[PDB]
Every structure is written in structure tokens, then in C-alpha cells.
Amino acid sequence: MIEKLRNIAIIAHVDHGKTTLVDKLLKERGITILAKNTANDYRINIVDTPGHADFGGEVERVMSMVDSVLLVVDAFDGPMPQTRFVTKKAFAYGLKPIVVINKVDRPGARPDWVVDQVFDLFVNLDATDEQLDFPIVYASALNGLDHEDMAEDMTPLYQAIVDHVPAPDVDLDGPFQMQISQLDYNSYVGVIGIGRIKRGKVKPNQQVTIIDSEGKTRNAKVGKVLGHLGLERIETDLAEAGDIVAITELNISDTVCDTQNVEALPALSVDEPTVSMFFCVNTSPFCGKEGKFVTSRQILDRLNKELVHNVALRVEETEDADAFRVSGRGELHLSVLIENMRREGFELAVSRPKVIFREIDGRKQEPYENVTLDVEEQHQGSVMQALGERKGDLKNMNPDGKGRVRLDYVIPSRGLIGFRSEFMTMTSGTGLLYSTFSHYDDVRPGEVGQRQNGVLISNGQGKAVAFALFGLQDRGKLFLGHGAEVYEGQIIGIHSRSNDLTVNCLTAVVLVPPIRMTLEQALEFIDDDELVEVTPTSIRIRKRHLTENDRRRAN
């Protein structure tokens, strides 16, 4: 069995062979088509390499599993460049191609010319080998010159895979050990851990442990691929692209292994998340009113549905039955997921975006971002200073002659959380800034992403009145204007000092117009003891615990 597995991935374009071609070894799929050839039997998994680029690095994860690749290229045309993004990543994991020139039959094809290209745009693609690049199987659909030529254009192909692809360097014995490479979901089945087995064996009930930390759960059902079809399975062992259920929320990169003498799997590799935040069921006094989906049931079902084709997203279950550790490549990764879940009719509450302090070697490495800001020459001071105050060391400034200046800080994500809102206030809109995650340098040390002020909090359900809002705006700025239905817990504006006030919003009358707190703004605002409650219409900000005497109880 073990020295006769061949694991490859395919690549193509629009005049796709693909399937067609993988159909033809026996629209549409996919993951992963387990062909099987013999004159010894060979299992041949043939995993699909997506033409789309979802995000993060979906293709990276695919090639965790495989040891070579099919590169189908149209003879008619030649290797066009959604093939290009993949094949780049395909050589980086040091994989040997098998080029396949499709549809040489069809009467306007340039089979040689193609191969001239399939080096050219291939030698500039880096490898560096190949060379071979052989591979080199001239296929047909409806199956002359070139190779062979040319019996039943079907058997030679089988030989090409088995002679140049090696079986995967894996260990049948030791413990059990599998990386979750891909991951998909169903509304009864659970979440399924699609993987290729790195060590050992899996019975369907067969207890195990899961990692980054200490998730231990029993197994249930463990279906392997077989044709366009995953069948249930009494046991599948090493090397097989075998796909598995019941464990958990199970995640990408996440790894399995015997609950004895193991732990764990490496390979980050470049998609790992930088920010945790809690998504939880809306427990407020509008706790199901302004929009439809609200059961925790509903939300996780939704969250896995993203988790599937969101490679950057990582969802975890809690000590709470109603909450979840949603993690992402960014915060703007999450604000999206949230905002979209608003527009779908979901109603949920979210804890502030606390970062991910991972740790390379000894010291807490934490995440950093290359920030760039474009401002008026007046603001420079008002801007430069505040970022310094956020542990944002300065790289460069290219002051562009006009009267503006460009500033290029690097900051810790931890430290940039909040800034966006205050940056607009300094520059009064003429404040062009955005950043991008850069790398994971060492911790800064000191507590930094922390706001000075405290909030004004209403003390019961009622419509607001200027008989309170006109006199409370002598304490700070308000998030609401006249006649908005609030509750005991709704933060309703920032205070001038750092203490919080449990006030009454209820009991020329000119209220200065309030603040347009956007979703992201309210995320980059709230404390560890506060929450953002999102309905499909409204954005509400509150306190984790709701009555003044419930806050006293805790703090």
C-alpha cells in the first residue's frame, strides 16, 4: 500500500482539461478524485489546485499534501496566467512538475511552441530544476505526432505519474499524526478535517489530541476519498489524503495525533492569524428585535461556513456556550465577517480586538504593522507625537514640496488599535492613512493600546430627551441625539475625565450633533469590560455587566 500512493495536484485555465481530464482517468470537482491504476495497485490522489485565489494562501495548504503536480496546458493556446500564481507556489515547496499538453487533436494546435513557452514562462518562474519538466505527456480529450506516439492516450499518462512522482515521505508506525490541510463543513456532520496522514493509523472511534494548545476529543467517523466520493472507513492509515469528522471547532493548520507520545505538527506557515476576538450571542434588552438570526446555534453554523473558504479565519469554542474565539489575518478581516453577518440579518455582540501574542523563541513576539500616513504640514506634530506615544518607531518621511508630508511608521498592531478614529480628529479628514501587517518582531513591554477616557452610561430603557442631553454635553461628547431608545448598559458618549458615569438620558434647545460610530470604530473603542452589540440596522455599544450595582459587584 504505502510505496504505491501518488499524491499530485492539477493546474489549468478556461480551455481547461482538468475534468475532462481527471474525469477521463475513469463542472466540477475537485477534492480530490482518487484514481487507481495497475498492469501492484497504485492509489493516485489528484488534489485540485484552485484557479481562484481566495486569500491568505489557500494553495500553500493544498501542497502540504502533495509531492508533485500535473500542469495541464492547452496546446491550442499555451499556459495562460491563473496557472502562474499556483505554479509559482508549486515550486517553492520543492515539487517536480508533470507538464501535460492537452487537446493536440484539435486542428489549431502548436504543441512544440507550447513547450518552448512552458520552459520560458517556467525558467523565469524559478525552480530551479526542470529541466524535467518530464512530465511532458501529450494528452488528448478524445482519446499523430509527438508522444507517444501514441496508443490509447491514457496508459502512458498513468506511467508518467507513477515514475516521476514519489510516494510521500511518511512514517506508518510511531503514533498517529495529521495536519488539517483543508477544511469543510456540514450542518449535521460537524466540521470535517480533510488532511493527509503524516504518521500512524485512524480507527473511527479512536481518541486523540489537537494543538497550538490542549484540545482533546474522541473521533467518530473517518471517510476516505474513492472516485468523486468520500466513503466512511473502518480504518485508513499513513500517507492517504483521508478526510475526517467529529473532532470538535477543528481548524486549518491545527494538527491531530495519538493521545500518547506525540505533539505536534509545525508549519505556520504564512496564513496564521494575528488578532483574536469574541463573537457572542446578543444578551441585551433588544435581544432579537432589529434583525432575524440570533441563536448561538445559528452563529457557529455561520462561522464554520466562513471557516471553510476563509483560510485566514480561525474559530474556537469557549467555556461559554454562547461565545467564540474568532481569530484573523487582521482586524479588517473580522470587521468584514461581522459587517457581512450584519447585512445577512445576524444579531451578535463582540469583545474588543485583543491581539495574538504568539511566541517565536523565548520572548513573546507580538504583531507589528508598516503604517503609512499622509497629512498636512501643520498636523505632523499632532500626528508624529501620538504614534510615538503608541510605541510606533519612525522609519521615513518624504515631505512632498507642496505643503504635505508622508510618514512611514512601524507600529505594533496592539498599539495601532484605536488610532484611526483619533487620526481623523487631528487632521480633520485630510488624513490619508492605512497600514498593513508587516511581521512578528519581539514584544514591546509596557501597556500601550489603552484609552485615557471613560464613558457615559444610561441607567434604563427609554427614549432620550434634551431635558438631559443639553446638560450632559457639559461632561463630554454624545454618541446619540434626541429620542433614541437606549437601555441600562448602553454607553451613550465619551466622558471628559477617565472615570465612568451612570447617568440619566431620559428625564433654542441645541444638542451638538453626535458621533457616527462605525462598526470598526466601535471595535477600536471598547474596553475589556465593554461590548459592541450589532444588529443589521444599528450599532450599539454597551458594558459587559449592565447595571451600576452590577459593575460595582465586579470591579
Side-chain angles (χ1 to χ4, degrees), residues 454-457 459-464 466-468:
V455 280
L456 311 168
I457 309 166
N459 65 350
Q461 297 144 12
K463 289 180 105 78
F467 214 114

Side-chain angles (χ1 to χ4, degrees), residues 220-231:
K221 339 181 198 223
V222 286
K224 193 179 172 200
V225 185
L226 186 273
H228 260 111
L229 251 190
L231 276 70

Side-chain angles (χ1 to χ4, degrees), residues 187-237:
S187 227
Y188 175 80
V189 170
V191 176
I192 300 93
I194 318 232
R196 198 268 260 115
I197 302 285
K198 324 268 155 161
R199 286 184 192 136
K201 272 156 264 202
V202 207
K203 303 182 184 198
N205 280 328
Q206 203 257 58
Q207 222 258 290
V208 281
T209 305
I210 307 301
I211 7 160
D212 246 276
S213 49
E214 268 94 48
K216 299 193 57 154
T217 71
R218 293 167 293 181
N219 197 327
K221 339 181 198 223
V222 286
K224 193 179 172 200
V225 185
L226 186 273
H228 260 111
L229 251 190
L231 276 70
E232 282 194 3
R233 227 295 161 270
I234 297 158
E235 81 84 50
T236 21
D237 74 351

Side-chain angles (χ1 to χ4, degrees), residues 146 165 433 508 523:
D146 38 85
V165 179
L433 154 117
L523 292 166

Side-chain angles (χ1 to χ4, degrees), residues 45-277 279-286 288-297 299-318 320-330:
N45 291 271
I46 296 185
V47 194
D48 194 304
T49 343
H52 69 264
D54 272 340
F55 32 77
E58 207 286 325
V59 172
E60 267 94 338
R61 301 279 87 176
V62 159
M63 294 179 306
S64 304
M65 300 153 77
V66 299
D67 310 286
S68 161
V69 288
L70 262 220
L71 177 48
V72 178
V73 182
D74 179 36
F76 248 49
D77 194 334
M80 278 282 186
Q82 32 270 64
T83 70
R84 266 217 58 156
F85 173 52
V86 174
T87 62
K88 175 156 205 161
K89 292 296 181 279
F91 294 33
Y93 292 79
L95 306 184
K96 187 114 141 143
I98 325 293
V99 175
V100 172
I101 316 304
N102 194 201
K103 296 172 203 312
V104 302
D105 291 340
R106 311 221 311 114
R110 306 182 287 189
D112 280 303
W113 185 95
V114 174
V115 176
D116 289 318
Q117 300 298 328
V118 184
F119 286 111
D120 290 1
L121 286 311
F122 208 110
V123 62
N124 72 241
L125 239 326
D126 270 31
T128 63
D129 276 14
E130 165 183 273
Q131 238 180 137
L132 311 94
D133 221 287
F134 244 133
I136 302 196
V137 182
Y138 302 75
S140 154
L142 314 177
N143 176 109
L145 70 170
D146 38 85
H147 179 94
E148 203 98 350
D149 78 85
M150 210 171 185
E152 217 124 12
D153 231 52
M154 261 333 127
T155 351
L157 226 204
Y158 290 116
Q159 291 271 36
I161 294 155
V162 186
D163 304 7
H164 285 265
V165 179
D169 194 19
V170 274
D171 166 59
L172 176 73
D173 313 291
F176 168 54
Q177 204 190 254
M178 195 195 75
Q179 192 194 260
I180 270 61
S181 289
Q182 283 171 315
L183 174 91
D184 78 319
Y185 166 66
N186 210 12
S187 227
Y188 175 80
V189 170
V191 176
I192 300 93
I194 318 232
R196 198 268 260 115
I197 302 285
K198 324 268 155 161
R199 286 184 192 136
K201 272 156 264 202
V202 207
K203 303 182 184 198
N205 280 328
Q206 203 257 58
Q207 222 258 290
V208 281
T209 305
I210 307 301
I211 7 160
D212 246 276
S213 49
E214 268 94 48
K216 299 193 57 154
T217 71
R218 293 167 293 181
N219 197 327
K221 339 181 198 223
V222 286
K224 193 179 172 200
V225 185
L226 186 273
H228 260 111
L229 251 190
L231 276 70
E232 282 194 3
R233 227 295 161 270
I234 297 158
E235 81 84 50
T236 21
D237 74 351
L238 192 79
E240 297 167 292
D243 344 345
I244 111 188
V245 327
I247 304 118
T248 76
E249 283 261 70
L250 182 58
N251 260 267
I252 289 151
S253 81
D254 219 332
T255 76
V256 202
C257 32
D258 263 4
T259 64
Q260 165 152 201
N261 192 64
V262 203
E263 326 286 292
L265 341 190
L268 257 80
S269 75
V270 273
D271 327 329
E272 276 225 281
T274 89
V275 190
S276 246
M277 88 164 95
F279 277 44
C280 32
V281 166
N282 185 357
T283 62
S284 87
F286 293 60
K289 290 190 162 189
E290 306 183 337
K292 67 201 209 157
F293 302 95
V294 318
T295 47
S296 115
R297 178 56 50 73
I299 299 159
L300 172 134
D301 196 280
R302 176 68 177 101
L303 289 184
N304 293 109
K305 278 156 87 284
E306 205 78 320
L307 235 193
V308 168
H309 39 66
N310 206 303
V311 189
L313 203 83
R314 310 260 168 284
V315 181
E316 305 179 283
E317 287 187 88
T318 58
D320 198 341
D322 286 12
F324 309 90
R325 213 66 6 203
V326 193
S327 331
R329 249 290 151 206

Side-chain angles (χ1 to χ4, degrees), residues 340-353 355:
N340 292 345
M341 283 172 78
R342 292 180 73 203
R343 281 190 265 92
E344 287 175 37
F346 264 93
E347 228 203 27
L348 73 167
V350 284
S351 88
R352 75 98 42 83
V355 310

Side-chain angles (χ1 to χ4, degrees), residues 425 427-437:
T425 302
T427 54
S428 315
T430 78
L432 327 181
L433 154 117
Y434 52 57
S435 77
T436 174
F437 163 92

